[PDB]
Amino acid sequence: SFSGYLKLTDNVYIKNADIVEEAKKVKPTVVVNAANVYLKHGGGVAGALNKATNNAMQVESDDYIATNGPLKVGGSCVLSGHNLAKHCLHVVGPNVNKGEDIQLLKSAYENFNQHEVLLAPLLSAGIFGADPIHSLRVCVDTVRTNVYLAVFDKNLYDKLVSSF
Ligand SMILES: CS(=O)(=O)Nc1ccc(C(N)=O)cc1
Known part of the structure; x- marks a missing residue:
């Protein structure tokens, strides 16, 4: 079970933690990945989750893309959670640096x-x-x-809690 989380609402919780370390500790049913439409886990949360699976998440993702094509921005797919979770829900949020x-x-x-x-x-x-x-x-x-939110950056975590 999840520990050290600050309760924000009835269903939203938040903690200053590395989502990879949090995933390895809890081994939740679902870990969310901050994915792109191509499931290319190069950097940020995606690169860090993929590196923790020893690239098994990338190999599985390339096979998924080869069969199904890219996801939509705002869409998702459920794949294996590997050594991090039962499943990984790859969710594509809009990338502001891509317009x-x-x-x-x-x-x-x-x-x-x-x-x-x-x-x-x-x-x-x-x-x-x-x-x-x-x-x-x-x-x-x-x-x-x-939803149990993991915020990597302490300074950002403090700003999120104090301004809620
Ligand atoms: C800034 S964040 O949106 O909280 N996502 C990150 C969390 C962890 C890591 C890492 N372990 O390298 C990178 C990005």
Whole structure:
């Protein structure tokens, strides 16, 4: 079970933690990946989750893309969680540094509603370029299931909690 989380709402929890370390500790049913449409896990949360699976997440993802083609921005797919979780829900939030519509962030969070409980990062935050305060607001206003948010950066975590 999840420990050390600060309760924000009835169903949204938050902790200053490395999502990879959190995944290895809890081994949740679902870990959310901050994915791109091609499932190319190069950097940010995706690169870090993929490196923890010894690249097994990338090999599985390339086979998925070869069969199904790319995901949509705002969409998702369920793949193996490997050594991190039972499953990994690869969710594509809009990448602001690629001109993608920030309005698609609500659609991306709607994917979380298909899972009772999830360990997740803030969608479109970090190298995706969106404001993390805005991502947290869309998360609490869109997700109805139990979401345990891992925020890597302490300074950002403090800013998110203090401004909520
Ligand atoms: C900034 S974030 O959106 O919280 N996502 C990250 C979390 C962890 C790591 C890592 N372990 O390298 C990278 C990015």
